[PDB]
Structure 1
Amino acid sequence: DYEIQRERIELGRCIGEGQFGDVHQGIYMSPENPALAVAIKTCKNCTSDSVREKFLQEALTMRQFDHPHIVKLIGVITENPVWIIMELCTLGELRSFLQVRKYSLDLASLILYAYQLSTALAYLESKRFVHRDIAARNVLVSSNDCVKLGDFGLSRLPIKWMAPESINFRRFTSASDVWMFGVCMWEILMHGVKPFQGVKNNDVIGRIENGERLPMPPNCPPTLYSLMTKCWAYDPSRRPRFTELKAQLSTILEEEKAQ
């Protein structure tokens, strides 16, 4: 059972918003342990049974996964006010983490973050789960040596990250997740810059259709840029699988550490 007693949670400052309400940082005091920092998703309209069901299904969605690079569910409080208690990735959003540390993070750390996310995505592809919202804004930082995919509810169009078949035909597969992951890798190697800054979504659709791609980030190893371009194959069958990305990223990471 994962019902948590409300008196064991202390609500802290707001760290984001969700479809159902504000998200807070806080503290959980379990019966046997010292303080555990947690994130608390709140729900304004969970007095309505359909809202409570949809909100608590976000906790059930995370509960089905168990991976070191995907945020974990700690517990839930199912009576009003309804809360979902998640693991807190203390260092916060990946984009601002990379922006602040642009001149202090080694290139090996950036490649490590891409590798870690590829392991989580290979795990999700083994469970036949299609994410649809892979982007640096949906990655959190647990430590300088650990990133995680964020909560799937809070991660929920992102045209600038989407494969052409998803934009145009609403087809969402592991191959369309691979295209998004290529964009996320580009964001990481760009220190948290977003794809296609300033460009209108409709223009991006035509540009990608005609072969334009995001350029090689400064200092990105050419082998890693080559791998990103394979993620952006127009034909989804030509994109690598997540297990292939995981193996290739491990090779690129080792090579960078050896330099």
Structure 2
Amino acid sequence: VFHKIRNEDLIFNESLGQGTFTKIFKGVRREVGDYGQLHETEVLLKVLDKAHRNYSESFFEAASMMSKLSHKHLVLNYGVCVCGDENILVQEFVKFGSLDTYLKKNKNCINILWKLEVAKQLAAAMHFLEENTLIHGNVCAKNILLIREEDRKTGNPPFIKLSDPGISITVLPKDILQERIPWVPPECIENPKNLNLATDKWSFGTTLWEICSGGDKPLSALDSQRKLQFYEDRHQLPAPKAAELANLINNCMDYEPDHRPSFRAIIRDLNSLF
């Protein structure tokens, strides 16, 4: 289980937006670190809405399970603050924010090599999860954090981490799941209890589509009724203008979950493109 952090050691600063039944803030944690040195550490504070306290177990659960598995491409959770009426997840603060925003902001200069590197790193994270039979359940660009930017001057590629999934689609309202088409795969719209490792392969494809589409969100022009019919008609996403990953996107977003390729095979596919 997560380490418990006192409310007194957390300072809330600026809002950084909202998630599903959550509000997100930049903050600071006062802590004693290694060698007993005192630190004033920048943190990301994810706060469950008071009205939705009933989702608290799910809010913390998969995050907790992920945090038991240390990996260079998985987000660092420091712990939780559950003092008083608060349900707060305390995370590392990532300077450059999440990928959905970054892609839009730096659209004019993100190229195939950058995308490929980011795709490979995400696949590495997902393979690690697959090997540990741990379902993520919400792979998307919003849940990818940019730890560091590319530096051509020095040879450094960008570096990302996969963030926590938030509250599970197994407990969310049907209308939220529908809004999340096409990240939520067809079998989970049919029955949320179908959440499986194969789920993450589909969402990974949707996420590659984002990475190639400059901040665009697939099917955003479709209301929830039309998103449902999109799956009923067995449509695929349009190929991004930069189509280098289109085949992979389609191979991952397979309406047959058993046919979706392993992350090992996906990684081998990615390596062949360079």
Counterpart check, 1:126 vs 2:131: yes
Counterpart check, 1:164 vs 2:186: yes
Counterpart check, 1:78 vs 2:100: no
**For 1:30, what is the secondary structure of its paired residue?**
strand
Q: 1:60 to 1:7 in 2, by over 3 A?
A: same
* Paired amino acid for 1:122: H
Q: Distance in 1 between matches of 2:219 and 2:21?
A: 29
Q: Distance in 2 between matches of 1:227 and 1:174?
A: 18
* Paired amino acid for 2:160: V
Report how many aligned residue pairs link the two structures: 249
Q: 1:10 to 1:102 in 2, by over 3 A?
A: same
CA deviations on 1:219-250 (whole Å, 9 max, x unpaired) are 232xx221111112222222111121123223
Q: Which moved more, 1:192-201 or 1:162-171?
A: 162-171
Q: Is the 8 A contact 1:176 1:236 kept in 2?
A: yes
Query: Where do 5+ consecutive residues of structure 2 fail to align?
Result: 150-157, 170-176
Within the candidate set 152, 157, 160, 1:147 is matched to 160
* Paired amino acid for 1:95: D
Counterpart check, 1:188 vs 2:211: yes
Counterpart check, 1:135 vs 2:134: no
**For 1:160, what is the secondary structure of its paired residue?**
coil
* Paired amino acid for 2:190: N
Partner of 1:15: 16
**For 1:159, what is the secondary structure of its paired residue?**
coil
Shift of 1:117: 1.2
Q: 1:44 to 1:204 in 2, by over 3 A?
A: closer
Partner of 1:68: 72
Shift of 1:167: 1.8
Q: 1:8 to 1:116 in 2, by over 3 A?
A: same
Q: Distance in 2 between matches of 1:138 and 1:18?
A: 10
C-alpha root-mean-square deviation of aligned residues, in Å? 2.7
Shift of 1:141: 1.9
Partner of 2:272: 251
CA deviations on 1:170-201 (whole Å, 9 max, x unpaired) are 32222222111111101111112111131233
Shift of 1:15: 1.1
Within the candidate set 101, 109, 123, 1:104 is matched to 109
Query: Where do 5+ consecutive residues of structure 1 fail to align?
Result: none
* Paired amino acid for 1:23: I
- Residue identity over aligned pairs, in percent, reads 27
Q: Is the 8 A contact 2:3 2:79 kept in 1?
A: yes
